[PDB]
PDB file of C-alpha atoms in Angstrom:
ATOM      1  CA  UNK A   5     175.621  70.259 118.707  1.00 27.61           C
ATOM      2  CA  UNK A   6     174.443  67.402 116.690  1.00 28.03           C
ATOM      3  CA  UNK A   7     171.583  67.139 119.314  1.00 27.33           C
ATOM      4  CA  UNK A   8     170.664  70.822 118.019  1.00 24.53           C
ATOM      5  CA  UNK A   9     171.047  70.563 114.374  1.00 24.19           C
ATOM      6  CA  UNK A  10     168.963  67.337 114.170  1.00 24.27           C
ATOM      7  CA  UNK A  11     166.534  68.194 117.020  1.00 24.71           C
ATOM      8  CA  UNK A  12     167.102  65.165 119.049  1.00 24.47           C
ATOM      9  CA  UNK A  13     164.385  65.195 121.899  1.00 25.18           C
ATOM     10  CA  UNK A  14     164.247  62.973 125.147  1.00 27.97           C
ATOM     11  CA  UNK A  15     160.790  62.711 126.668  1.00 26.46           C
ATOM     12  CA  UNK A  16     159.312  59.988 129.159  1.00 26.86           C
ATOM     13  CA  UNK A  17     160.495  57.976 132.299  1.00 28.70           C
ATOM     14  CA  UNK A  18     161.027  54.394 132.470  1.00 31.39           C
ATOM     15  CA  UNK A  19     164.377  52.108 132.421  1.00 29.57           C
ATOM     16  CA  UNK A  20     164.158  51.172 128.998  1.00 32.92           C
ATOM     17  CA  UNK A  21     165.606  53.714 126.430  1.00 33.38           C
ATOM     18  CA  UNK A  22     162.812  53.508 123.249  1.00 31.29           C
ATOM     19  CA  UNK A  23     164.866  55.323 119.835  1.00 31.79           C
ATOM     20  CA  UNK A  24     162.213  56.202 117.451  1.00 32.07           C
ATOM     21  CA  UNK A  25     164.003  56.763 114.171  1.00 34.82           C
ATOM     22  CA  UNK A  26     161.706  58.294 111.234  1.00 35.18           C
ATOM     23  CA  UNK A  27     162.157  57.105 107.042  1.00 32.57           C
ATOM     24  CA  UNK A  28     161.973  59.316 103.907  1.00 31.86           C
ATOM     25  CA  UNK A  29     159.351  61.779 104.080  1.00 31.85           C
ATOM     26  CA  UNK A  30     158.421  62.664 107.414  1.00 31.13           C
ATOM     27  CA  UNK A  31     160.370  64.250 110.240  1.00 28.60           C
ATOM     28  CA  UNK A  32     159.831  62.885 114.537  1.00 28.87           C
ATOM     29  CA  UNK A  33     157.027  64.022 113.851  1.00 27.37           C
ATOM     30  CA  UNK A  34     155.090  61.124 112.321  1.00 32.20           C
ATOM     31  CA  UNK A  35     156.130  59.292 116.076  1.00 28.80           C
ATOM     32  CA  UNK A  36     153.711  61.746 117.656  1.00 29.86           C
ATOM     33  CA  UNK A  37     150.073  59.417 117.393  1.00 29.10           C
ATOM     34  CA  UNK A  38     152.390  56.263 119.072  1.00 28.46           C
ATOM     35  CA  UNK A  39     154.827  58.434 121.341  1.00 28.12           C
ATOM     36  CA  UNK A  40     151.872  58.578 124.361  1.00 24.54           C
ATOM     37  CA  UNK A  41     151.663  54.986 124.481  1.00 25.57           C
ATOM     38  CA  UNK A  42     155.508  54.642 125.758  1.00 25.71           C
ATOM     39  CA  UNK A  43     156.323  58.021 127.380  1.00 27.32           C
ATOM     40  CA  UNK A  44     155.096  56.688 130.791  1.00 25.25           C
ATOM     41  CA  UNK A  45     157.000  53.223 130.276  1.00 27.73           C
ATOM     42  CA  UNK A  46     159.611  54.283 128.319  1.00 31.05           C
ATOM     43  CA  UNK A  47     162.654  56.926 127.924  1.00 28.65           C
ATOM     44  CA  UNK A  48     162.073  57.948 124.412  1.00 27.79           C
ATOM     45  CA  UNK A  49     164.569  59.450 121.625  1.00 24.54           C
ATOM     46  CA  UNK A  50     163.662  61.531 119.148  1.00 24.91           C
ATOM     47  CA  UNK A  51     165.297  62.865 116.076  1.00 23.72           C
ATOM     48  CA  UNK A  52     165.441  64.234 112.655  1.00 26.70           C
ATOM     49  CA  UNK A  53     167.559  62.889 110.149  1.00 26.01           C
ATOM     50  CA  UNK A  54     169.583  65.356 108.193  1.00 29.49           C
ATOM     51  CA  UNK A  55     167.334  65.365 105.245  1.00 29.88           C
ATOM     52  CA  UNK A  56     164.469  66.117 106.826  1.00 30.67           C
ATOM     53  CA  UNK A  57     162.717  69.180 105.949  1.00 31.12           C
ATOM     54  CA  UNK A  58     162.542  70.084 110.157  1.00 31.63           C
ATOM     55  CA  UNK A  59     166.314  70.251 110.125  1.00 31.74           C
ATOM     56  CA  UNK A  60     168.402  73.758 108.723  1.00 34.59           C
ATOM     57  CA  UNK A  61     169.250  72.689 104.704  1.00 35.35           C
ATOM     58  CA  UNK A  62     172.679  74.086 105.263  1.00 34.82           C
ATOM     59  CA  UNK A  63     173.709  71.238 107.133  1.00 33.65           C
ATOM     60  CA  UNK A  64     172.774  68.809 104.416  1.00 31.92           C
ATOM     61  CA  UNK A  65     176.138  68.450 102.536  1.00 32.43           C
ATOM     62  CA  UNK A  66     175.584  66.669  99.191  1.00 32.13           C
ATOM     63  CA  UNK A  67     179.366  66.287  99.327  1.00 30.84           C
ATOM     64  CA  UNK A  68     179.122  63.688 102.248  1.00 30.56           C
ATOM     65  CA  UNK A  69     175.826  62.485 102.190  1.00 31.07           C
ATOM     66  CA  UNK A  70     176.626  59.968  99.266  1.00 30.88           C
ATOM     67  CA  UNK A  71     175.908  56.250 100.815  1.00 30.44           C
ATOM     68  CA  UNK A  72     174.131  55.784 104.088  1.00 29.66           C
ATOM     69  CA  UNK A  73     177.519  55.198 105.974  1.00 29.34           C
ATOM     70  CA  UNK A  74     177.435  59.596 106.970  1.00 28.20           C
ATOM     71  CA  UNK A  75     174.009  58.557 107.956  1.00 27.23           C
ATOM     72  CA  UNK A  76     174.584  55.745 110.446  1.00 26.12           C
ATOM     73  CA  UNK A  77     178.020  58.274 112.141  1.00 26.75           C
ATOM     74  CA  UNK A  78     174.983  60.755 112.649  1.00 25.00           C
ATOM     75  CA  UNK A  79     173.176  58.024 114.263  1.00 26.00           C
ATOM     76  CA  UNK A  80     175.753  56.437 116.239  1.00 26.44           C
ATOM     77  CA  UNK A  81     177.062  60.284 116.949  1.00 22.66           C
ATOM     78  CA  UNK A  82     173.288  61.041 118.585  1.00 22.10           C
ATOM     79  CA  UNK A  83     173.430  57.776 120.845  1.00 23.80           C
ATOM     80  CA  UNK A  84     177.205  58.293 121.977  1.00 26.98           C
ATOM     81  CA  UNK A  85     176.578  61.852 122.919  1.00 22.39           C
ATOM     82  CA  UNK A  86     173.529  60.984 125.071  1.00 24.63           C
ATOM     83  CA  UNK A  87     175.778  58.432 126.712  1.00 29.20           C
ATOM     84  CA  UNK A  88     173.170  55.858 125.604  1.00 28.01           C
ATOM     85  CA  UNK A  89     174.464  52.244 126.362  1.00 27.98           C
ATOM     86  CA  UNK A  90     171.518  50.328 125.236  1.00 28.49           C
ATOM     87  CA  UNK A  91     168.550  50.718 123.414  1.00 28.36           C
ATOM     88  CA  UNK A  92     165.417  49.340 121.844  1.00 28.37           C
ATOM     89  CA  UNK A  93     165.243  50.670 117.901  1.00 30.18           C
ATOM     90  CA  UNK A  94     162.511  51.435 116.300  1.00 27.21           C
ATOM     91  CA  UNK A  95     163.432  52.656 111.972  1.00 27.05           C
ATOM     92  CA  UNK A  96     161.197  52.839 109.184  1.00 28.03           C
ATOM     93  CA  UNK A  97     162.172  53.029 105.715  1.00 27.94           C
ATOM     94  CA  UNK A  98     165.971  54.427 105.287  1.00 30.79           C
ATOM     95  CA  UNK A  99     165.898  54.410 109.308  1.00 32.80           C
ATOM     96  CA  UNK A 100     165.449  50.774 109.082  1.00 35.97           C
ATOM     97  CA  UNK A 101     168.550  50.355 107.027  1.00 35.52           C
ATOM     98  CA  UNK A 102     170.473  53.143 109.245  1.00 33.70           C
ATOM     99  CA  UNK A 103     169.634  50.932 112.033  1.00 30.48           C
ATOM    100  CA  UNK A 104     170.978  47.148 109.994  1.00 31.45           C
ATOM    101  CA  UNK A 105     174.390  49.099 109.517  1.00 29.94           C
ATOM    102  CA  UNK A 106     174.457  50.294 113.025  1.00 29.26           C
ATOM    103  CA  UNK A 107     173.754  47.342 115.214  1.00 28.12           C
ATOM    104  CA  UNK A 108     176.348  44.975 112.811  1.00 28.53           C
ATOM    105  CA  UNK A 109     178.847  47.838 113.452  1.00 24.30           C
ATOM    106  CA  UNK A 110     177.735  48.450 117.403  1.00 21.88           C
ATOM    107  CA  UNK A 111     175.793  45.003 118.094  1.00 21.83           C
ATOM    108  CA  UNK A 112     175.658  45.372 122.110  1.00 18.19           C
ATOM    109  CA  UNK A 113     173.974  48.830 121.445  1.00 16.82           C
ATOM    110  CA  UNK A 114     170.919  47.577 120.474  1.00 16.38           C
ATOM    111  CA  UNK A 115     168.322  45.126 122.603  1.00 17.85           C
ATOM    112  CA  UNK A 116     166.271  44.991 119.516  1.00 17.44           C
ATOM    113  CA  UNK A 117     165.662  46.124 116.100  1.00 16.77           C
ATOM    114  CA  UNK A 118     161.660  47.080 114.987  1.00 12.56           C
ATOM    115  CA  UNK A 119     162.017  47.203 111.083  1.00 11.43           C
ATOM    116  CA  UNK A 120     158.865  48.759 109.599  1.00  9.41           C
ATOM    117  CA  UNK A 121     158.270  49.131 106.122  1.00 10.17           C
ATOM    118  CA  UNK A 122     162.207  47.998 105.339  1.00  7.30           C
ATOM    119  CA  UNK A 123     163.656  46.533 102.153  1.00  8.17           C
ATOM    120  CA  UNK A 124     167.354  45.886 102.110  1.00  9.36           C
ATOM    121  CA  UNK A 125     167.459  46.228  98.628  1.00  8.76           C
ATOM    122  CA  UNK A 126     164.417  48.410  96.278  1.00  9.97           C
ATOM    123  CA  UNK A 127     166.208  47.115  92.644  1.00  8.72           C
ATOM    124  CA  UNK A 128     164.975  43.930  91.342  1.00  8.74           C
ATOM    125  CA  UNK A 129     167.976  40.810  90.915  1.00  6.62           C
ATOM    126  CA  UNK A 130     167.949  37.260  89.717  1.00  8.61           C
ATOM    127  CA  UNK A 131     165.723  35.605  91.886  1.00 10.46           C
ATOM    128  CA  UNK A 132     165.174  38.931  94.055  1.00 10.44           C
ATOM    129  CA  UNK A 133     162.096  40.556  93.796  1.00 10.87           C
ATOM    130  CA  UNK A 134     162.772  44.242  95.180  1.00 10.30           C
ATOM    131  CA  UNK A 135     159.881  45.721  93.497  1.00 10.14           C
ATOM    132  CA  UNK A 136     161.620  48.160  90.854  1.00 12.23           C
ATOM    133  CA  UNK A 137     163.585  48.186  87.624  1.00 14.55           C
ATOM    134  CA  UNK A 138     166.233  50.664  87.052  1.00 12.45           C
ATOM    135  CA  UNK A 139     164.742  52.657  83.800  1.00 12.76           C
ATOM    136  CA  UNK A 140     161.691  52.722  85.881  1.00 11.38           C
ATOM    137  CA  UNK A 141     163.090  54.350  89.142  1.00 13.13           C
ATOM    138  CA  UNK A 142     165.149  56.683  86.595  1.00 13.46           C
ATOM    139  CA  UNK A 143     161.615  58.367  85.633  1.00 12.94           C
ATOM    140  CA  UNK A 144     160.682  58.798  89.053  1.00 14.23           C
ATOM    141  CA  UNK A 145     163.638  60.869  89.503  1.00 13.95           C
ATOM    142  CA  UNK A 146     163.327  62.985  86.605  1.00 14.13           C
ATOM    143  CA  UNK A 147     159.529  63.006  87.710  1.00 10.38           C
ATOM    144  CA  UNK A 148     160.484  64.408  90.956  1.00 12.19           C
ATOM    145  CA  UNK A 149     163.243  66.696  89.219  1.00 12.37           C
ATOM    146  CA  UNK A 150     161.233  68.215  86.730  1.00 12.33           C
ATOM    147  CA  UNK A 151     157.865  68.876  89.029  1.00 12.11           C
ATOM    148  CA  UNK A 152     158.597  68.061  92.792  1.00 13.07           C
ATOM    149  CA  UNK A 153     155.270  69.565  93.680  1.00 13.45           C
ATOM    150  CA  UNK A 154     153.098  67.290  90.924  1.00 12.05           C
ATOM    151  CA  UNK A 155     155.001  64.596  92.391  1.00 11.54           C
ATOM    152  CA  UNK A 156     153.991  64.470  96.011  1.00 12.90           C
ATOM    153  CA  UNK A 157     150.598  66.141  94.901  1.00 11.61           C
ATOM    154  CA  UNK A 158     150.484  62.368  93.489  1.00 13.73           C
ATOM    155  CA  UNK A 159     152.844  60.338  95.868  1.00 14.60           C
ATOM    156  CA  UNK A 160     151.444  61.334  98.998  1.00 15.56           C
ATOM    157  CA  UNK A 161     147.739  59.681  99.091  1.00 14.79           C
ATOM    158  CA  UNK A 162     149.192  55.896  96.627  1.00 13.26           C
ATOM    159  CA  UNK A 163     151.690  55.689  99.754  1.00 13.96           C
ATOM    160  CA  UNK A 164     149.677  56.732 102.570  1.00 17.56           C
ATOM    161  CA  UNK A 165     146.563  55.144 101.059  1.00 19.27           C
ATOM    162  CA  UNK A 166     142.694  55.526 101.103  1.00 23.13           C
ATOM    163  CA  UNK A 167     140.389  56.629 103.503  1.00 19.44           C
ATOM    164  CA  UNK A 168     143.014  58.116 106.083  1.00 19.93           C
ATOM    165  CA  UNK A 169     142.938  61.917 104.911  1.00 20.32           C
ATOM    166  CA  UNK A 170     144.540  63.038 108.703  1.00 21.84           C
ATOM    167  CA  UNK A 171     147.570  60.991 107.957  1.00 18.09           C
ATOM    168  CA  UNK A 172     147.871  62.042 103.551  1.00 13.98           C
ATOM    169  CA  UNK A 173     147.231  65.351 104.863  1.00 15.66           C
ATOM    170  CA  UNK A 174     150.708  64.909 107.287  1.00 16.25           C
ATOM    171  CA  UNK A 175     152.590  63.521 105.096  1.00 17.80           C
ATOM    172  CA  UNK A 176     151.806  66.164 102.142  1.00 14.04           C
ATOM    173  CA  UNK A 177     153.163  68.729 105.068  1.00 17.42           C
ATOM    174  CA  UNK A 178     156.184  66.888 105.573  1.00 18.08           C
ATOM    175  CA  UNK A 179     157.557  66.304 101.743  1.00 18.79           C
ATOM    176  CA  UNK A 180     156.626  70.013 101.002  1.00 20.78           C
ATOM    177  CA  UNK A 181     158.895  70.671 103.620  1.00 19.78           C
ATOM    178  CA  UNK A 182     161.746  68.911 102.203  1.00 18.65           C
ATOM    179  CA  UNK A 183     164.119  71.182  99.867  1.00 19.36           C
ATOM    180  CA  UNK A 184     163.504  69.502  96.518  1.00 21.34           C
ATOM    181  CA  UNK A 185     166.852  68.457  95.502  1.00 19.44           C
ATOM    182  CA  UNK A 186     167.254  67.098  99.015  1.00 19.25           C
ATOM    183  CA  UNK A 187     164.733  64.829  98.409  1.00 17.78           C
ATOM    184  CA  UNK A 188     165.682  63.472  94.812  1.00 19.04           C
ATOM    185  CA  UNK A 189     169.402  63.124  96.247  1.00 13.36           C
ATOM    186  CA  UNK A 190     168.297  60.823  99.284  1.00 13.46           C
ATOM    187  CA  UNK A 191     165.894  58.568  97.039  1.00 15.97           C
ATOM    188  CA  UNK A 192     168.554  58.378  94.672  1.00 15.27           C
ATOM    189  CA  UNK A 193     171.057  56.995  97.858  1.00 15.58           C
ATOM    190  CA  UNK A 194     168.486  54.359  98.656  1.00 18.29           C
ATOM    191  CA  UNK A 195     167.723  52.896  95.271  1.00 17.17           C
ATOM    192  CA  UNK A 196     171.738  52.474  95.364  1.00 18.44           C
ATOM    193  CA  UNK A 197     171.613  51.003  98.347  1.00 18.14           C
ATOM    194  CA  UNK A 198     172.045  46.941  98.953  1.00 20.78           C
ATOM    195  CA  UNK A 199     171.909  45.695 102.020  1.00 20.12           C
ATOM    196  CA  UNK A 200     171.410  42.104 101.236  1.00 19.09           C
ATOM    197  CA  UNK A 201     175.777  41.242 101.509  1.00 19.32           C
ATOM    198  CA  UNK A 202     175.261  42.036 104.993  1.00 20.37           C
ATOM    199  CA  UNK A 203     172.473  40.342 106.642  1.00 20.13           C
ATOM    200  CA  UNK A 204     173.612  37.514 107.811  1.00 20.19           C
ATOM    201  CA  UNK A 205     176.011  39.730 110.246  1.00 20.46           C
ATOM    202  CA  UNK A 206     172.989  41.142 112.147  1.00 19.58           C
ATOM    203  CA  UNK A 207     172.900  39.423 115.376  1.00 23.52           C
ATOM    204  CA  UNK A 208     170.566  41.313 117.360  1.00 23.52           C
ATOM    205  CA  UNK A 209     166.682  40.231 117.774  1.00 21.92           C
ATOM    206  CA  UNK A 210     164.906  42.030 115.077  1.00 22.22           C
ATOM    207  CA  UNK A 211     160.901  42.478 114.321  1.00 18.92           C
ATOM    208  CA  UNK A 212     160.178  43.188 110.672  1.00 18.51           C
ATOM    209  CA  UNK A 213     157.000  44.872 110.466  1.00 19.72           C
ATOM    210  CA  UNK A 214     154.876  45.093 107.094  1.00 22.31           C
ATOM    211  CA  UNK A 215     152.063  46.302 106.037  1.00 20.28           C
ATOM    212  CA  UNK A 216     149.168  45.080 103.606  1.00 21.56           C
ATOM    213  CA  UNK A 217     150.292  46.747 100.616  1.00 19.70           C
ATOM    214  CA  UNK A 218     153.355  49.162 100.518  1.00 17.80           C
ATOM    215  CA  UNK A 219     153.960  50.389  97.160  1.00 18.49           C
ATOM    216  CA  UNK A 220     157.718  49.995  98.169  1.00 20.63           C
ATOM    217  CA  UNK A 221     158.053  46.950  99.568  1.00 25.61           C
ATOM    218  CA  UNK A 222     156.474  43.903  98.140  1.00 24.51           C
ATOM    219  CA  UNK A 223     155.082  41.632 100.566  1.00 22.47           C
ATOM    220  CA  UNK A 224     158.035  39.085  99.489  1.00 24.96           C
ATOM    221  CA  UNK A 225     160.631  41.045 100.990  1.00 28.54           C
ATOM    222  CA  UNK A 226     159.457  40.205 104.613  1.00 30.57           C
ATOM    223  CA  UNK A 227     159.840  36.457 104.376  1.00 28.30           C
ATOM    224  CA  UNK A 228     163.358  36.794 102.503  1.00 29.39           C
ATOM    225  CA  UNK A 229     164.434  38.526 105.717  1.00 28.94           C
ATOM    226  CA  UNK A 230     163.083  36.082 107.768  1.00 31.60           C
ATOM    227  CA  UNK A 231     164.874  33.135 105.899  1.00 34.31           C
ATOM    228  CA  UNK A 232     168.043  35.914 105.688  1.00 34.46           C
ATOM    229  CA  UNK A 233     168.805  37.920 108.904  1.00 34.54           C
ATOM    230  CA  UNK A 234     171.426  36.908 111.061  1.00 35.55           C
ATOM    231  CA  UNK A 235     169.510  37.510 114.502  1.00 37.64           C
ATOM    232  CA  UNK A 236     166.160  35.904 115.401  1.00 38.03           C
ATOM    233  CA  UNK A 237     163.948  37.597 113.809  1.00 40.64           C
ATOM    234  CA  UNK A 238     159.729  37.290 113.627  1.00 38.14           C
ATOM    235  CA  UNK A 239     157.945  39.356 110.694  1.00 36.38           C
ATOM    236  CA  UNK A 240     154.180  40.851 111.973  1.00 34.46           C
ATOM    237  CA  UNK A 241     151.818  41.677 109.696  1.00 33.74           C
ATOM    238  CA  UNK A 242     149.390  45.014 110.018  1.00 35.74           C
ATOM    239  CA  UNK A 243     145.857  44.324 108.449  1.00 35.23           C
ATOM    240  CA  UNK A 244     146.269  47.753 107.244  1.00 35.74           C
ATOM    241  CA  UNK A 245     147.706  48.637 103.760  1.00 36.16           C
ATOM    242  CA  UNK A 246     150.149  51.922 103.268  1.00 38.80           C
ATOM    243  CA  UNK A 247     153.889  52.702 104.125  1.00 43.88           C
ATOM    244  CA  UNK A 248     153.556  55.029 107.209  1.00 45.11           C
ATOM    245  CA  UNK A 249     151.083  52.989 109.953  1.00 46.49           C
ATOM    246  CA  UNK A 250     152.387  55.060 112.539  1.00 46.93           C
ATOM    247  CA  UNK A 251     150.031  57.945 111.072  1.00 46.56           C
ATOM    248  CA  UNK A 252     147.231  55.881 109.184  1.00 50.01           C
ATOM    249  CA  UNK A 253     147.115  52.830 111.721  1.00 52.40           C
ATOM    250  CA  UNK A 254     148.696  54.046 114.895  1.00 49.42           C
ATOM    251  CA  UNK A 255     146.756  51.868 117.356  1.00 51.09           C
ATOM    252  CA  UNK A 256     146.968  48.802 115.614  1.00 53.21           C
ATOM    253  CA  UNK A 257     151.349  50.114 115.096  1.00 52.81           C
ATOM    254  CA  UNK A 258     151.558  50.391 118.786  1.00 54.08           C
ATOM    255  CA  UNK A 259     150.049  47.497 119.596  1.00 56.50           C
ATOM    256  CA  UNK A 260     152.243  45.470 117.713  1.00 58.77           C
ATOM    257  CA  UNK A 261     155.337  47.904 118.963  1.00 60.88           C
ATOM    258  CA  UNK A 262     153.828  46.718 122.810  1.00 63.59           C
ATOM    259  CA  UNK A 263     154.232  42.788 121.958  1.00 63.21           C
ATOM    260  CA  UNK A 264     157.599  43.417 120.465  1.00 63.64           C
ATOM    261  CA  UNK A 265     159.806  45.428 122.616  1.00 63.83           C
ATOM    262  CA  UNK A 266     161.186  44.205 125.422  1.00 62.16           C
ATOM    263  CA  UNK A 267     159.544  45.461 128.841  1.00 62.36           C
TER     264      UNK A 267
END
């Protein structure tokens, strides 16, 4: 029932279940370039958050989606109902904090955590450098209010970035998808999000991957969660800039995804 409405999708063989949990944006979808590199290894889970523009916009109740607690029951929802036990996770962007919440609520469901392109906190703060000020973020939401179309017209290639036209081309496909107001209402949850009380309580291994140059997460953030997570944690670079490697860089991504996760 939940594994209908978010189009949660089980492919592969192996002993090792593989969740592949998608940010703001995009939909499974953007897992497709990496997923044939673990299907024959690997028992992989797919799904769709609720905001995705894959998944029916009736279900997307602005009455409960307010914080990214709903979020993390949909999660934890997907992985009881599979019967899952254990799991290697894999988030990027709001998945990434979905996944945080998760493993410090459930931390014997997770073998390991793969962060990719993750801030715990967007908002700059004395002596935090989060990237963004709070009249700034307040035009991109009217921006995005006022013209949602202009918006990713101009969003999609800075994040993505230069010379990978397959993978701005994707990602263009997946944000028009999105219902406008969805999208505004789930930027607006993770700008109010702050995930830095909490990270000392993660205890399972964790991987934070970055890339070169993500327009939302300064290159700072990776070593603060290196000196701030609770678990052992290693941070790998990609020599590669953008926010969604797992469309512009997939090789290099699932290289780096090989090294990490156990088996």
């Amino acid at each position: 029932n939940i594994l209908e409405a978010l189009n949660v999708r089980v492919v592969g063989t192996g002993d090792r279940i593989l969740f592949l949990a998608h940010g703001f944006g995009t939909d499974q979808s953007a897992w497709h370039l990496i997923l044939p590199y673990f299907t024959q290894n690997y028992r992989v889970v797919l799904y769709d958050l609720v905001c995705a523009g894959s998944v029916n916009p009736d279900y997307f109740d602005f009455n409960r989606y307010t914080t990214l607690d709903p979020y993390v029951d949909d999660l934890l929802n997907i992985v009881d109902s599979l019967g899952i036990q254990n799991c290697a996770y894999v988030g990027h962007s709001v998945s990434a904090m979905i996944g945080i919440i998760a493993s410090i609520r459930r931390p014997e469901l997770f073998s390991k955590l793969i962060l990719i392109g993750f801030s715990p906190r967007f908002l700059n703060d004395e002596d935090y450098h989060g990237g963004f000020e709070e009249g700034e973020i307040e035009k991109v939401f009217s921006a995005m209010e006022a013209n949602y179309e202009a918006w990713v017209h101009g969003f999609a290639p800075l994040a993505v970035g230069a010379d990978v036209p397959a993978a701005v081309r994707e990602f263009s496909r997946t944000l028009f998808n999105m219902r406008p107001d969805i999208s505004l209402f789930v930027s607006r949850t993770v700008f109010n999000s702050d995930l830095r009380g909490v990270l000392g309580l993660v205890r399972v291994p964790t991987c934070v991957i970055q890339t070169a140059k993500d327009v939302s997460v300064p290159a700072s953030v990776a070593e603060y969660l290196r000196s701030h997570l609770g678990g052992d944690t290693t941070v790998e670079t990609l020599k590669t800039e953008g926010h969604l490697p797992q469309l512009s860089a997939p090789a290099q991504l699932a290289q780096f995804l090989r090294r990490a996760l156990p088996r």
